[PDB]
Structure formats: structure tokens, C-alpha cells
Amino acid sequence: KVFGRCELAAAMKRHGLDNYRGYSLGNWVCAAKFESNFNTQATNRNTDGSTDYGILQINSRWWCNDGRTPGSRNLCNIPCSALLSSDITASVNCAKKIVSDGNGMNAWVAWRNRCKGTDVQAWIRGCRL
Ligand SMILES: [Cl-]
Ligand SMILES: [Cl-]
Ligand SMILES: [Cl-]
Ligand SMILES: [Cl-]
Ligand SMILES: [Cl-]
Ligand SMILES: [Cl-]
Ligand SMILES: [Cl-]
Ligand code: NA
């Protein structure tokens, strides 16, 4: 599914991401924009053989099982396929674990490089929330 900007802001708020670990909703919308362009079916293969899945491009080295990332973990206890669903529940619940890991949203390199310290409230401007 390709979400609209405000549609995704709403879904993320519905699932308790807004101000989760102190990160405002605009930070999460911005991260999703640059990770996936709001496409739940986004995938990206890394040089190490791991794969990133879904609207927040969650990686198979730690967070989900895809059966093809040797030595990896599955700390979200889900198949990586769950991260490609039109229903963002699995992505949001797994993102809550990731952002709790110690480095906050710096775990998403695209957030650090493209969203951190910018006027992220622009990402929810106009939205009925
Ligand atoms: Cl947009
Ligand atoms: Cl915000
Ligand atoms: Cl594996
Ligand atoms: Cl595990
Ligand atoms: Cl599995
Ligand atoms: Cl949803
Ligand atoms: Cl933090
Ligand atoms: Na894994």
C-alpha cells in the first residue's frame, strides 16, 4: 500500500508512535518518507546480504526473520514479510523496539541524514489528527 502523508500520520498516531521515546509524529512521517516513500512494499538489499523491509525499512540482521540473513536475530519475533502489510501494526510495534535500543532514531541512517534537526512538524501540517 502507498499511504498518503496525512493518512500515514494518522495511522502512526492510532498505533501510539506520536511522541514515542520523545519523537514527535513529524519525525516518524519524515523517516517513512525517505525510507520507503510511504510504500509498505518497499525492500532494499544491503551489501552484507541483509534486507530492509516496509515503510520504515526495518533490517533482517536484528529485527525480523527472512531465512536468508546468516547469523541474524529476530528481536521483533516476526517474519520480515509482516513488515510489507497494508496494516502497519507490525512495522510500528517493531519500530518501538528499535527506537528503544539506545541510539533513538539514529538507528535509521536516513532519519539522521535527512530529518534530524529539520522542521519536521511540516510533515504533519494540514493533517486532521
Ligand atoms: Cl509527501
Ligand atoms: Cl512533529
Ligand atoms: Cl536468517
Ligand atoms: Cl532472536
Ligand atoms: Cl518467521
Ligand atoms: Cl494501518
Ligand atoms: Cl533519544
Ligand atoms: Na533475522
PDB file of C-alpha atoms and ligand atoms in Angstrom:
ATOM      1  CA  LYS A   1       0.000   0.000   0.000  1.00  0.00           C
ATOM      2  CA  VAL A   2       1.200   3.532  -0.722  1.00  0.00           C
ATOM      3  CA  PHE A   3      -0.031   5.801   2.088  1.00  0.00           C
ATOM      4  CA  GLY A   4      -0.816   9.442   1.796  1.00  0.00           C
ATOM      5  CA  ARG A   5       1.207  11.768   4.084  1.00  0.00           C
ATOM      6  CA  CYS A   6      -1.695  12.641   6.431  1.00  0.00           C
ATOM      7  CA  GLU A   7      -3.167   9.075   6.146  1.00  0.00           C
ATOM      8  CA  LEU A   8       0.145   7.658   7.473  1.00  0.00           C
ATOM      9  CA  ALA A   9       0.484  10.347  10.155  1.00  0.00           C
ATOM     10  CA  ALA A  10      -2.999   9.282  11.384  1.00  0.00           C
ATOM     11  CA  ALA A  11      -2.207   5.532  11.317  1.00  0.00           C
ATOM     12  CA  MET A  12       1.056   6.105  13.235  1.00  0.00           C
ATOM     13  CA  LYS A  13      -0.804   8.172  15.868  1.00  0.00           C
ATOM     14  CA  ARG A  14      -3.540   5.463  16.061  1.00  0.00           C
ATOM     15  CA  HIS A  15      -0.739   2.957  16.941  1.00  0.00           C
ATOM     16  CA  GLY A  16       0.890   5.187  19.606  1.00  0.00           C
ATOM     17  CA  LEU A  17       4.044   6.309  17.704  1.00  0.00           C
ATOM     18  CA  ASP A  18       3.388  10.053  18.210  1.00  0.00           C
ATOM     19  CA  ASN A  19       5.947  11.243  20.846  1.00  0.00           C
ATOM     20  CA  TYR A  20       7.108   7.626  21.387  1.00  0.00           C
ATOM     21  CA  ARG A  21      10.586   7.830  23.112  1.00  0.00           C
ATOM     22  CA  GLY A  22      10.108  11.632  22.774  1.00  0.00           C
ATOM     23  CA  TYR A  23       9.989  11.592  18.941  1.00  0.00           C
ATOM     24  CA  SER A  24       7.158  13.753  17.566  1.00  0.00           C
ATOM     25  CA  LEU A  25       4.917  12.354  14.816  1.00  0.00           C
ATOM     26  CA  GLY A  26       6.674  14.515  12.149  1.00  0.00           C
ATOM     27  CA  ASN A  27       9.963  12.679  12.861  1.00  0.00           C
ATOM     28  CA  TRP A  28       8.270   9.326  12.095  1.00  0.00           C
ATOM     29  CA  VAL A  29       6.500  10.608   8.955  1.00  0.00           C
ATOM     30  CA  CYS A  30       9.777  12.131   7.705  1.00  0.00           C
ATOM     31  CA  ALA A  31      11.660   8.842   8.323  1.00  0.00           C
ATOM     32  CA  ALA A  32       8.972   6.892   6.411  1.00  0.00           C
ATOM     33  CA  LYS A  33       9.094   9.370   3.520  1.00  0.00           C
ATOM     34  CA  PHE A  34      12.811   8.919   2.936  1.00  0.00           C
ATOM     35  CA  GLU A  35      12.980   5.210   3.834  1.00  0.00           C
ATOM     36  CA  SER A  36      10.053   3.988   1.650  1.00  0.00           C
ATOM     37  CA  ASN A  37       8.242   6.965   0.006  1.00  0.00           C
ATOM     38  CA  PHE A  38       5.280   5.745   2.164  1.00  0.00           C
ATOM     39  CA  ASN A  39       5.209   2.340   0.321  1.00  0.00           C
ATOM     40  CA  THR A  40       4.638  -0.647   2.668  1.00  0.00           C
ATOM     41  CA  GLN A  41       6.101  -2.990  -0.023  1.00  0.00           C
ATOM     42  CA  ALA A  42       9.495  -1.252  -0.170  1.00  0.00           C
ATOM     43  CA  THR A  43      12.544  -3.551   0.053  1.00  0.00           C
ATOM     44  CA  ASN A  44      16.265  -2.885  -0.137  1.00  0.00           C
ATOM     45  CA  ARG A  45      19.100  -5.441  -0.221  1.00  0.00           C
ATOM     46  CA  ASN A  46      22.295  -4.450   1.554  1.00  0.00           C
ATOM     47  CA  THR A  47      25.857  -5.448   0.579  1.00  0.00           C
ATOM     48  CA  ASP A  48      26.065  -7.686   3.785  1.00  0.00           C
ATOM     49  CA  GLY A  49      23.137  -9.820   2.408  1.00  0.00           C
ATOM     50  CA  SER A  50      20.609  -8.410   4.929  1.00  0.00           C
ATOM     51  CA  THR A  51      17.367  -6.856   3.625  1.00  0.00           C
ATOM     52  CA  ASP A  52      15.358  -3.819   4.732  1.00  0.00           C
ATOM     53  CA  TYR A  53      11.523  -4.159   4.707  1.00  0.00           C
ATOM     54  CA  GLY A  54       8.485  -1.937   4.715  1.00  0.00           C
ATOM     55  CA  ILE A  55       7.545   1.670   5.363  1.00  0.00           C
ATOM     56  CA  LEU A  56      10.429   2.165   7.870  1.00  0.00           C
ATOM     57  CA  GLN A  57      12.912  -0.169   6.093  1.00  0.00           C
ATOM     58  CA  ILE A  58      13.489  -2.409   9.154  1.00  0.00           C
ATOM     59  CA  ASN A  59      16.553  -4.684   8.730  1.00  0.00           C
ATOM     60  CA  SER A  60      16.826  -8.511   8.934  1.00  0.00           C
ATOM     61  CA  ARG A  61      20.236  -8.545  10.759  1.00  0.00           C
ATOM     62  CA  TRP A  62      18.470  -7.893  14.146  1.00  0.00           C
ATOM     63  CA  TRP A  63      14.756  -7.328  13.910  1.00  0.00           C
ATOM     64  CA  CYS A  64      12.907  -9.876  11.703  1.00  0.00           C
ATOM     65  CA  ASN A  65      13.333 -13.368  10.213  1.00  0.00           C
ATOM     66  CA  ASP A  66      13.657 -13.814   6.442  1.00  0.00           C
ATOM     67  CA  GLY A  67      15.635 -17.108   6.500  1.00  0.00           C
ATOM     68  CA  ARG A  68      18.432 -15.657   4.315  1.00  0.00           C
ATOM     69  CA  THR A  69      20.485 -13.453   6.700  1.00  0.00           C
ATOM     70  CA  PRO A  70      23.130 -15.775   8.224  1.00  0.00           C
ATOM     71  CA  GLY A  71      23.865 -15.226  11.936  1.00  0.00           C
ATOM     72  CA  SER A  72      20.956 -12.768  12.260  1.00  0.00           C
ATOM     73  CA  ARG A  73      18.412 -12.363  15.048  1.00  0.00           C
ATOM     74  CA  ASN A  74      14.636 -11.793  15.036  1.00  0.00           C
ATOM     75  CA  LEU A  75      14.128  -9.499  18.026  1.00  0.00           C
ATOM     76  CA  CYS A  76      10.666  -8.331  16.854  1.00  0.00           C
ATOM     77  CA  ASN A  77       9.642 -12.055  16.629  1.00  0.00           C
ATOM     78  CA  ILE A  78       8.035 -11.657  13.146  1.00  0.00           C
ATOM     79  CA  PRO A  79       8.631 -12.830   9.597  1.00  0.00           C
ATOM     80  CA  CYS A  80      10.100  -9.861   7.684  1.00  0.00           C
ATOM     81  CA  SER A  81       7.084 -10.298   5.272  1.00  0.00           C
ATOM     82  CA  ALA A  82       4.826  -8.933   8.086  1.00  0.00           C
ATOM     83  CA  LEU A  83       6.590  -5.583   7.571  1.00  0.00           C
ATOM     84  CA  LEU A  84       5.185  -5.349   3.998  1.00  0.00           C
ATOM     85  CA  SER A  85       1.477  -5.476   5.051  1.00  0.00           C
ATOM     86  CA  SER A  86      -1.047  -2.727   4.260  1.00  0.00           C
ATOM     87  CA  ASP A  87      -1.637  -2.834   8.080  1.00  0.00           C
ATOM     88  CA  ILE A  88       1.330  -1.015   9.706  1.00  0.00           C
ATOM     89  CA  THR A  89       0.845  -2.658  13.184  1.00  0.00           C
ATOM     90  CA  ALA A  90       3.903  -4.964  12.794  1.00  0.00           C
ATOM     91  CA  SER A  91       6.138  -2.127  11.493  1.00  0.00           C
ATOM     92  CA  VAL A  92       5.076   0.222  14.315  1.00  0.00           C
ATOM     93  CA  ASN A  93       5.492  -2.381  17.104  1.00  0.00           C
ATOM     94  CA  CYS A  94       8.944  -3.301  15.738  1.00  0.00           C
ATOM     95  CA  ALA A  95       9.958   0.402  15.360  1.00  0.00           C
ATOM     96  CA  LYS A  96       9.102   0.909  19.062  1.00  0.00           C
ATOM     97  CA  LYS A  97      11.682  -1.805  19.922  1.00  0.00           C
ATOM     98  CA  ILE A  98      14.315  -0.322  17.576  1.00  0.00           C
ATOM     99  CA  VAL A  99      13.998   3.264  18.837  1.00  0.00           C
ATOM    100  CA  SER A 100      14.316   1.937  22.433  1.00  0.00           C
ATOM    101  CA  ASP A 101      17.687   0.210  21.575  1.00  0.00           C
ATOM    102  CA  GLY A 102      19.886   3.148  22.833  1.00  0.00           C
ATOM    103  CA  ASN A 103      20.524   5.390  19.776  1.00  0.00           C
ATOM    104  CA  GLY A 104      16.949   6.625  19.345  1.00  0.00           C
ATOM    105  CA  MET A 105      16.020   7.394  15.745  1.00  0.00           C
ATOM    106  CA  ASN A 106      19.702   7.464  14.710  1.00  0.00           C
ATOM    107  CA  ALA A 107      19.129   3.699  14.042  1.00  0.00           C
ATOM    108  CA  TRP A 108      17.544   4.987  10.797  1.00  0.00           C
ATOM    109  CA  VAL A 109      20.515   6.479   8.913  1.00  0.00           C
ATOM    110  CA  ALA A 110      18.090   8.296   6.529  1.00  0.00           C
ATOM    111  CA  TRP A 111      16.421   9.957   9.578  1.00  0.00           C
ATOM    112  CA  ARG A 112      19.846  11.167  10.870  1.00  0.00           C
ATOM    113  CA  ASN A 113      20.891  12.440   7.423  1.00  0.00           C
ATOM    114  CA  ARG A 114      17.565  13.939   6.119  1.00  0.00           C
ATOM    115  CA  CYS A 115      15.152  14.571   9.049  1.00  0.00           C
ATOM    116  CA  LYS A 116      17.160  15.191  12.255  1.00  0.00           C
ATOM    117  CA  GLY A 117      17.203  18.902  13.178  1.00  0.00           C
ATOM    118  CA  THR A 118      14.899  19.933  10.326  1.00  0.00           C
ATOM    119  CA  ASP A 119      11.447  21.468  10.721  1.00  0.00           C
ATOM    120  CA  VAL A 120       9.792  18.018  10.932  1.00  0.00           C
ATOM    121  CA  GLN A 121       6.411  19.475  12.067  1.00  0.00           C
ATOM    122  CA  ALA A 122       5.971  20.383   8.326  1.00  0.00           C
ATOM    123  CA  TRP A 123       5.353  16.646   7.739  1.00  0.00           C
ATOM    124  CA  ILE A 124       2.029  16.736   9.717  1.00  0.00           C
ATOM    125  CA  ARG A 125       0.978  20.309   8.678  1.00  0.00           C
ATOM    126  CA  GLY A 126      -2.596  20.431   7.348  1.00  0.00           C
ATOM    127  CA  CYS A 127      -3.498  16.974   8.683  1.00  0.00           C
ATOM    128  CA  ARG A 128      -6.674  16.393  10.725  1.00  0.00           C
ATOM    129  CA  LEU A 129      -5.104  14.440  13.666  1.00  0.00           C
TER     130      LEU A 129
HETATM  131 CL    CL B   1       4.744  13.645   0.522  1.00  0.00          CL
HETATM  132 CL    CL B   2       6.051  16.923  14.552  1.00  0.00          CL
HETATM  133 CL    CL B   3      18.108 -15.910   8.716  1.00  0.00          CL
HETATM  134 CL    CL B   4      16.138 -13.799  18.109  1.00  0.00          CL
HETATM  135 CL    CL B   5       9.426 -16.324  10.632  1.00  0.00          CL
HETATM  136 CL    CL B   6      -2.721   0.734   9.309  1.00  0.00          CL
HETATM  137 CL    CL B   7      16.601   9.721  22.129  1.00  0.00          CL
HETATM  138 NA    NA B   8      16.930 -12.020  11.022  1.00  0.00          NA
END
